[model samples]
Target: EDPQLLVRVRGGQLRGIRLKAPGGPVSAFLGIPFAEPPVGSRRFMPPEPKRPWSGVLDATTFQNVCYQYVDTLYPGFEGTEMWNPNRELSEDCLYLNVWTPYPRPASPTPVLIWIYGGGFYSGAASLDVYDGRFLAQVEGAVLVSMNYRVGTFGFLALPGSREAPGNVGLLDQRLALQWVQENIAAFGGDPMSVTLFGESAGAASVGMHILSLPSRSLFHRAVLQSGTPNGPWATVSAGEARRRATLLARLVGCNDTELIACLRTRPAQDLVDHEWHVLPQESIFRFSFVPVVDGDFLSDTPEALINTGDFQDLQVLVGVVKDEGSYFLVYGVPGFSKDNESLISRAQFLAGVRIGVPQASDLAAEAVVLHYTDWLHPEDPTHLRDAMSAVVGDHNVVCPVAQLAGRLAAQGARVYAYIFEHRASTLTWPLWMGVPHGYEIEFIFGLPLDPSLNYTTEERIFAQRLMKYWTNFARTGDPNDPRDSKSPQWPPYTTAAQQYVSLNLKPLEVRRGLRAQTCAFWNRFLPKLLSAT
Candidate 1:
């Protein structure tokens, strides 16, 4: 029989569950409230800390996920379905989960906190893939994951209105981090040794936390997987945020004067259903509701903050998959499905670039098209597809991460970067997609540790090595272990060398200047081109 576990914190007592792991047993305190439910009047406002409870709160089970419209964009596809929330959906979803090793270490262990990513529209901390049992058990660190608000419920903003401030989703995360600071000691976790890590939109959230003054002190290190605040789609300007919120209000049959009051009365599902209607097209290439520059939580744009050296000085581990845009192309675009083998012409490729970056001027768009084209086999469909994927990946994820890493390294912060080139053996997507976005999650969580899942022996070994690298980074600022000589040494990224690990099955090799010319086009040339026009 599994043993019951209890832990006391500032709020009260919590009853958790203990599960067996390969190394040892681990305790999981699931669904502990970190903030007051954002229902009724509390909706759209900053989260208030959860009040003290009267008795031992049963934290054995997962709880409600923030209300969101189920992703139906790619129907019948396992890729989209895998990330959907399996738990009930409700407004009362500000909960966090904690996992600690069975036999606590002599001293307080490092804390690794996760934030899930769904383009700021959907995600849950209770997903089965994110289970922290193996990480805590084998790696011997306290792992924490929290459910924050998403979509319309989390990010609606009214410029001058206190009742409906922007970036309440980020506020929810801040409150959860505060909760960790106040209570992690009881769980054998060092509050001061917290490492905040996330993927995609979640990674962008980590980057934002680093840039924002209020959130800098809450965590000591950061891991950003395949996303950063420098990405064009990461955050919307205050004006754009207001426009979307206003459009959403109209869609939900609310007037500007009665926006907040009417929204409070409307069904939560109604808000989610209409959230994306604010966008002209319901395409995955664009997102409707995301974090905003509200001048409070985000005092200025992320670009300005980075330029002025206004962010926290801390170690950061950031990386992106090889085919970050393949996932988006197959799911977001109209005709780029699994079965389609049709060739794309030069005109079609240029149109795709325009759709990806609609604001680009004619000259800038032509420059982008010219930059990605393969002159030797310019008309070959396969080559064109690869080029299109590169365009999207570079603009959206790869180049942004490169820029962030370069900027951070220039500022004297210890930064380690990687390019994930290994594809999971059990992947259901077509083979040509290469290591698509978010594919590293399973290995990061040590799913291959279970033999029954039938992962290849190579994959299992890679997963173990990847977990060691991640856990080592969490324990200290560096991913390399001084005591371990078997693993490859991951060098710190520098402006001069631009060193980074190439993560694949063959062996770990340090590479220099990932996509240098293409990144320069996006990070330097494109900005100058746009400004000149």
Candidate 2:
């Protein structure tokens, strides 16, 4: 602690900790306030940079996590990656953490900022698995993790009113990036070489920033894992956001004449307690509060914006797990069984609704159900963990992600895609949930690994390769470095062949369009459905 882990950045000086390690210690600056606390009159407004502080601020411990309701009847945040009640939650949670192997590397190092995902309703920057020590030390990059508002406080778009314009959570993240651009250099990171990355809702958040013109230039590259802005759960219409806001206000006994003031004055938890009402009863997905087209932050729907080629032109790496929707088994269609007849009926029904064909007459919905059923082969819950997951899995996550990748590639943007198929040596959940969502996270951090299955040498090598790819992407805007023979070459994705690298149990290999037939069906089906509706 000779230099005392104290670094002076734009805001002020921060006293961090030297995380003990074998190859030397990584300097970890935990819980640095990146923005002013969103409390009292500041509630629901977009975040502002933190005011300057006096003296050396203690940033050795993680700070308050954004307020959220994680452990509910919903299965979105279930399993190990999500720990809703594990940390203390509060409204004053606009803080960030940083890890760097060298306080000031001879040459400024690349930076990776991680945004946690809890369906946009719950998540914290303090999750243990998110610890950046190993990544920073091994990859020689500065790792930044940030906390942003979630649930009611983060997203509440009111109709015919500008008091609450929504997307506050995303704006909080935007400000964090701004903070990084202004201050990361002081912590040994190259501000100009920053990459924004995240998982699940967080990945969707990265997509939001990628598409949002206002926040586009904040970073030079982006990585999205298992989520995209175009996915089913990433966005809600303004009208729907308004309806949910109205319901919450009435539920909390707030009158319209003074609604904004009334809700603002209530204790934060009172808003957090009624988080469930935000989701419409017939939702195909579990997310309730999420980003919306708030006009200012998002001028149009994510899909429309992307269609017009309005997104930032930058290096992009995006992909999904083998079974992205396996976690939703809890929400399987009721009364639906494994019989072939029932599979066709329920699959068609679910696809029809999710693709905007609320009624049974749309030929598009029928096409989707027929295509996926033929490709995946129909089955019941006992097989493929029931059929809805497979159906919705592609409908919600897999296909849409592929659609984005294909579209981005078509536009001649730099895009690399992948499919995570390395199941833990020992299964974490049921084997049925093939490479369940967020499994790639453990590999990225390279610690707090699954205890049940002893990691094979192959598995360990795969993890190292993944970290190298991720960090290399962060460094040079490409996962493969010609100089590094150990790192495999990843071909840029193209719509022609839909070429992508598959991170399997074996060494990395190139694979054509993932779920080729399924994605083909969706890419064509969803656009027409969306345009029609």
lDDT of each: 0.86, 0.77
RMSD over all Cα atoms, model 2 = 3.9
TM-score of each: 0.96, 0.89
Model 2, span 429-500: residue lDDT tens: 666666877878878886523333367777766767788889889988789965757655689898898789
| Residue pairs with backbone overlap in model 1 | none
Provide the RMSD of all predictions against the true structure, rounded to 1 decimal: 1.8, 3.9
Best by lDDT: 1
- Candidate 2 TM-score to native: 0.89
The residue-by-residue lDDT of candidate 1 on 389-456, one tens digit each, is: 78888999999999998888887688999999899888888876788889999899988888877899
User: Considering only N, C-alpha and C atoms within 3 Å, which residue pairs clash in candidate 2?
Assistant: 338-380, 381-386
For candidate 1, the C-alpha RMSD (Å) to the true structure equals: 1.8
**Model 2 Cα displacement at 129 (Å)?**
1.9
